[PDB]
Amino acid sequence: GVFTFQDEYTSTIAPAKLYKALVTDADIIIPKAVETIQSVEIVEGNGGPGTIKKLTFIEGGESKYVLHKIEAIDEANLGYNYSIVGGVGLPDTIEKISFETKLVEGANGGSIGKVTIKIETKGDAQPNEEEGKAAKARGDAFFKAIESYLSAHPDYN
Numbered sequence: 001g002v003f004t005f006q007d008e009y010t011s012t013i014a015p016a017k018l019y020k021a022l023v024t025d026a027d028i029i030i031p032k033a034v035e036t037i038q039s040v041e042i043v044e045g046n047g048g049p050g051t052i053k054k055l056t057f058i059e060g061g062e063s064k065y066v067l068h069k070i071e072a073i074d075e076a077n078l079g080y081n082y083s084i085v086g087g088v089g090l091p092d093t094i095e096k097i098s099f100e101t102k103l104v105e106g107a108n109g110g111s112i113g114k115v116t117i118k119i120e121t122k123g124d125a126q127p128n129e130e131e132g133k134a135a136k137a138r139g140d141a142f143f144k145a146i147e148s149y150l151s152a153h154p155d156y157n
C-alpha cells in the first residue's frame with residue numbers, strides 16, 4: 001500500500017535562513033543544534049541527487065544511524081526531497097519511506113516547514129502508528145532545537 005502524511009513545523013526563522021541551516025549547512029548545524037543527533041556526514045556523492053548522508057543519533061540510550069538519499073535539492077524554491085535507504089534493526093512494515101519538504105514564509109517573518117511523508121508497505125500492511133507519532137515528535141523536537149540554536153547564533157561560520 002501507499003500512505004501519505006503531512007506535517008507542518010512553524011519557526012521564527014526566515015525561510016531561506018532556515019533552509020540554509022537544514023540543507024546547505026546541515027552537516028555542521030544539525031549536530032550542534034539537535035541534542036539527539038551526533039553527526040550528519042556524506043557517505044557518497046557531491047551533495048546533489050543521489051548523495052547518501054549518514055545521520056547518527058542516540059535512541060533509547062543506543063547509538064544508531066539512518067541513511068538518507070537525496071532525491072531532489074532545489075535551493076531556489078527552498079525544496080529538499082529525500083528517502084530513508086538504511087538503518088539499524090530488523091525490517092518492519094515500511095518497504096519505503098520518503099519525504100518531500102518545502103519551506104515557506106510564515107508568521108512575523110518566520111517560516112512554515114512543510115513535509116509530505118510517503119510510506120510504501122507490502123500489500124495491505126499498514127503504517128505503524130506509534131512510529132509515526134514518535135517520528136512526528138522527533139520532527140517537532142528537531143525544528144525546536146534548530147530554532148533555539150539559530151536564535152542564539154544568527155551568524156555562524
Ligand SMILES: C/C(=C\CNc1ncnc2[nH]cnc12)CO
Nearest residue numbers: 022023026053068080082101113
Ligand atoms: C537533515 C536531513 C533531513 C531532514 N531535513 C529536513 N526535514 C524537514 N524539513 C526540511 N526542509 C529542508 N530540509 C528539511 C538530511 O537528509
Ligand SMILES: C/C(=C\CNc1ncnc2[nH]cnc12)CO
Nearest residue numbers: 005006007127128129132133136
Ligand atoms: C499511521 C497513523 C498515524 C501516524 N501519523 C501521524 N501521527 C501523528 N501526527 C501526525 N501528523 C501527520 N501524520 C501523523 C494512523 O494509524
Ligand SMILES: C/C(=C\CNc1ncnc2[nH]cnc12)CO
Nearest residue numbers: 005007099115117132135136139
Ligand atoms: C521532519 C521530518 C519528518 C518527520 N515526520 C514524520 N516522519 C515519519 N513518519 C511520519 N508520519 C508522520 N509524520 C512523520 C522530515 O525530515
Ligand SMILES: C/C(=C\CNc1ncnc2[nH]cnc12)CO
Nearest residue numbers: 036055057058059066138139142
Ligand atoms: C531528520 C530527523 C531525524 C533524524 N532521524 C532520527 N533522529 C533521532 N532518533 C531517530 N530514531 C529514528 N530516526 C531518528 C527529523 O526528526
Ligand SMILES: [Ca+2]
Nearest residue numbers: 031034035037
Ligand atoms: Ca547534537
